Design an enzyme around this catalytic site. Structure first.
Site, PDB file in Angstrom:
ATOM      1  CB  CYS A  66       3.022   0.950   7.413  1.00 26.59           C
ATOM      2  SG  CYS A  66       1.364   1.393   8.002  1.00 26.59           S
ATOM      3  N   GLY A  87       3.362   6.249  10.460  1.00 29.53           N
ATOM      4  CA  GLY A  87       4.676   5.994   9.913  1.00 29.53           C
ATOM      5  C   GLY A  87       5.267   4.652  10.273  1.00 29.53           C
ATOM      6  CG  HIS A 140      -0.465   0.045   2.547  1.00 30.87           C
ATOM      7  ND1 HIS A 140       0.301   1.096   3.007  1.00 30.87           N
ATOM      8  CD2 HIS A 140      -0.635  -0.783   3.610  1.00 30.87           C
ATOM      9  CE1 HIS A 140       0.611   0.896   4.279  1.00 30.87           C
ATOM     10  NE2 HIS A 140       0.054  -0.236   4.669  1.00 30.87           N
TER      11      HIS A 140
HETATM   12  O1  LIG Z   1       1.007   4.863   9.425  1.00 36.95           O
HETATM   13  C1  LIG Z   1      -0.162   4.563   9.643  1.00 36.95           C
HETATM   14  C2  LIG Z   1      -0.577   4.087  10.989  1.00 36.95           C
HETATM   15  C3  LIG Z   1      -0.334   2.792  11.376  1.00 36.95           C
HETATM   16  C4  LIG Z   1      -0.716   2.311  12.685  1.00 36.95           C
HETATM   17  O2  LIG Z   1      -0.529   1.137  13.071  1.00 36.95           O
HETATM   18  N1  LIG Z   1      -1.320   3.209  13.499  1.00 36.95           N
HETATM   19  C5  LIG Z   1      -1.587   4.522  13.168  1.00 36.95           C
HETATM   20  C6  LIG Z   1      -2.214   5.372  14.083  1.00 36.95           C
HETATM   21  C7  LIG Z   1      -2.460   6.673  13.730  1.00 36.95           C
HETATM   22  C8  LIG Z   1      -2.092   7.154  12.466  1.00 36.95           C
HETATM   23  C9  LIG Z   1      -1.485   6.326  11.566  1.00 36.95           C
HETATM   24  C10 LIG Z   1      -1.209   4.986  11.894  1.00 36.95           C
HETATM   25  N2  LIG Z   1      -1.107   4.636   8.683  1.00 36.95           N
HETATM   26  C11 LIG Z   1      -0.926   5.180   7.341  1.00 36.95           C
HETATM   27  C12 LIG Z   1      -0.982   4.053   6.338  1.00 36.95           C
HETATM   28  N3  LIG Z   1      -2.197   3.237   6.460  1.00 36.95           N
HETATM   29  C13 LIG Z   1      -2.771   2.645   5.363  1.00 36.95           C
HETATM   30  C14 LIG Z   1      -2.746   3.251   4.101  1.00 36.95           C
HETATM   31  C15 LIG Z   1      -3.293   2.605   3.001  1.00 36.95           C
HETATM   32  C16 LIG Z   1      -3.829   1.340   3.147  1.00 36.95           C
HETATM   33 CL1  LIG Z   1      -4.503   0.529   1.772  1.00 36.95          CL
HETATM   34  C17 LIG Z   1      -3.823   0.720   4.386  1.00 36.95           C
HETATM   35 CL2  LIG Z   1      -4.483  -0.867   4.589  1.00 36.95          CL
HETATM   36  C18 LIG Z   1      -3.290   1.359   5.484  1.00 36.95           C
HETATM   37  C19 LIG Z   1      -2.562   2.840   7.829  1.00 36.95           C
HETATM   38  C20 LIG Z   1      -2.414   3.967   8.866  1.00 36.95           C
HETATM   39  C21 LIG Z   1      -3.551   4.998   8.813  1.00 36.95           C
HETATM   40  N4  LIG Z   1      -4.710   4.518   9.573  1.00 36.95           N
HETATM   41  C22 LIG Z   1      -5.925   5.248   9.211  1.00 36.95           C
HETATM   42  C23 LIG Z   1      -7.091   4.734  10.016  1.00 36.95           C
HETATM   43  O3  LIG Z   1      -6.857   4.872  11.410  1.00 36.95           O
HETATM   44  C24 LIG Z   1      -5.694   4.142  11.772  1.00 36.95           C
HETATM   45  C25 LIG Z   1      -4.482   4.620  11.014  1.00 36.95           C
END
Ligand SMILES: O=C(c1cc(=O)[nH]c2ccccc12)N1CCN(c2ccc(Cl)c(Cl)c2)C[C@@H]1CN1CCOCC1
Ligand SMILES: O=C(c1cc(=O)[nH]c2ccccc12)N1CCN(c2ccc(Cl)c(Cl)c2)C[C@@H]1CN1CCOCC1
Lengths: 300, 300
Positions: free
Chosen positions: B145, B143, B41
């Site tokens: 991931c 950040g 992703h």
């Molecule tokens: O870096 C993180 C991130 C990981 C985490 O473990 N906890 C976090 C806590 C707070 C903010 C961000 C995160 N992100 C950016 C990438 N993302 C993503 C992008 C495209 C696809 Cl296709 C998929 Cl599957 C996943 C996941 C996440 C964003 N999400 C939005 C919904 O609320 C939870 C966070």
């Protein structure tokens, strides 16, 4: 989100761990530049345990009496000396893996990462706090002496603990890297025991703020209290007194959550007086006191 | 003595972490030999999150679209491909710090260490279990991931998890290093949620054996139960059924403590039916289920 007991990545410290052997005793050493640091009780016999005179035992040793092994390579010792309760073995080879480092002594209530080691080989990493009674509730078996505790700031390793002994209650005592014991403990055979301990109040409050940041709110309330009234309740429950400087340190957390420090103190007072009534906070059924405000801000 | 949630030393994994940038998105990747593994992703835009067709998005990319940075050193991408939900970026330089490694998929109820990373830079290490619902209760921020989970056996790193997403309840989902998700989760925008979870029974019993090894015995009793009678109580309390193989796995701990498995089961039935009445076990006021029998034997 989430909240875990989180240690610093240990790689910079793993590259410094060596094995020190003297006689039939083997333990761990810390190899920085061309010096190896280890607990001086490595030179102790079983016999001279009640009242060892370490100055006597050391004058009777020569450099050839110490075997230092960095993995598969043997380090030749070219000097030896004592600083307080640690031994300093000068070796002919500077450790190419030496990180930037500092020797810092920590305060009761501060946290650090412990790299448990056996035979110079790291086996596990976990987070500890220095208790108010200057013990640590570690996890250590036979051969763990010489394991170190540390924090990492940017690229710099601040070594703060070297492991020396296990007390009868199963808690642990050691020194800073200058060889100075944390607390009223000595490296000789006595009936020494941990003193009475107390709960680190500023840390419990920091951890309640972590809980609010992570969505646990059931323990919040509209009530507030004064600093003096809260401290009367802290004393009754064997909690450390809260200072204005503690209130100040909790400021950032208070601002991020919009929960005044004295408001969180009112919630802690109710938690102490009422219990949890079957609920949990951040996956725990007791009030946790081994996260500092810094730990919370770092992870949250 | 002592008992801590203990991670593996993270150094072998720290040397493999890199930063992968595609467009305006940056996350972590894992650099082994001349391949960098990261969540696919990374090629997504905010535009199409609902139903991204990754085959389309990838064929529209070239090697120049991926920026890989190992510390201060930039790595030239010479090939790219997708394996399930992971991206494989072939680089012109084999990682000289590559440990011996293996890609293994773990079972619900197994534990592993997580190296939380941001911008290719490790920030902390902690121990996790795979929940029966295939989530992990991690600690992850924006950040994170691309962070990986692993176990270490002898000198060999078994990578078992790459981090992909955080679910609405604040738990985490990801894949093995072949890109295959743990559980019924997808790398696209849906209302997906963690399914119902259950408590890992064999781990709770392992942790009770750890407690007996460490001198907590108040919860023991003279009673015993059958395997089938215990399982009826387990089902009532949303505990997993215990198998004879679980009983066999607990054998060594049973033998070290002289407490038959089904005897310990009787103690667990009483703990479930009565609670703890204000007492703790290994510093917890609840029944911990994220230590495997192997974790207990390794640390005790
Ligand atoms: O870096 C993180 C991130 C990981 C985490 O473990 N906890 C976090 C806590 C707070 C903010 C961000 C995160 N992100 C950016 C990438 N993302 C993503 C992008 C495209 C696809 Cl296709 C998929 Cl599957 C996943 C996941 C996440 C964003 N999400 C939005 C919904 O609320 C939870 C966070
Ligand atoms: O390696 C360990 C060890 C450390 C630990 O943290 N926990 C353990 C758990 C189980 C067995 C051993 C240990 N040991 C050997 C060296 N030792 C010692 C030697 C001379 C001096 Cl002068 C001093 Cl101060 C200390 C401390 C310790 C032995 N003690 C005896 C009392 O019961 C607890 C273990």
């Amino acid at each position: 989100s989430g909240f875990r007991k989180m240690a610093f990545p240990s790689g910079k410290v793993e590259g410094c761990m060596v094995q020190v052997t003297c006689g039939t005793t083997t333990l761990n050493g810390l190899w920085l530049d061309d010096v190896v640091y280890c607990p001086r009780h490595v030179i102790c016999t079983s016999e001279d345990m009640l009242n060892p005179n370490y100055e006597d035992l050391l004058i009777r040793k020569s450099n050839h009496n110490f075997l230092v092994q960095a993995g598969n390579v043997q380090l030749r010792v070219i000097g030896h000396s004592m600083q307080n309760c640690v031994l300093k073995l000068k070796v002919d080879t500077a450790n190419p893996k030496t990180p930037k480092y500092k020797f810092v002594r920590i305060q009761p209530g501060q946290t650090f990462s412990v790299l448990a080691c056996y035979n110079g080989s790291p086996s596990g990493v976990y987070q500890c706090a220095m208790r108010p009674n200057f013990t640590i509730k570690g996890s250590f078996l036979n051969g763990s002496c010489g394991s170190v505790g540390f924090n990492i700031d940017y690229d710099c390793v601040s070594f703060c603990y070297m492991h020396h002994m296990e007390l009868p209650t199963g808690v642990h005592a050691g020194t800073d890297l200058e060889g100075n014991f944390y607390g009223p403990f000595v490296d000789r055979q006595t009936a020494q025991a941990a003193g009475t301990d107390t709960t680190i109040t500023v840390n419990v409050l920091a951890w309640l703020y972590a809980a609010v940041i992570n969505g646990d709110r059931w323990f919040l309330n509209r009530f507030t209290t004064t600093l003096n009234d809260f401290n009367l309740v802290a004393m009754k429950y064997n909690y450390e007194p809260l200072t204005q400087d503690h209130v100040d340190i909790l400021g950032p957390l208070s601002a991020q959550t919009g929960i005044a420090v004295l408001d969180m103190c009112a919630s802690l007072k109710e938690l102490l007086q009422n219990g949890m009534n079957g609920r949990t906070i951040l996956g725990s059924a007791l009030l946790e006191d081994e996260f500092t405000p810094f730990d919370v801000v770092r992870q949250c």
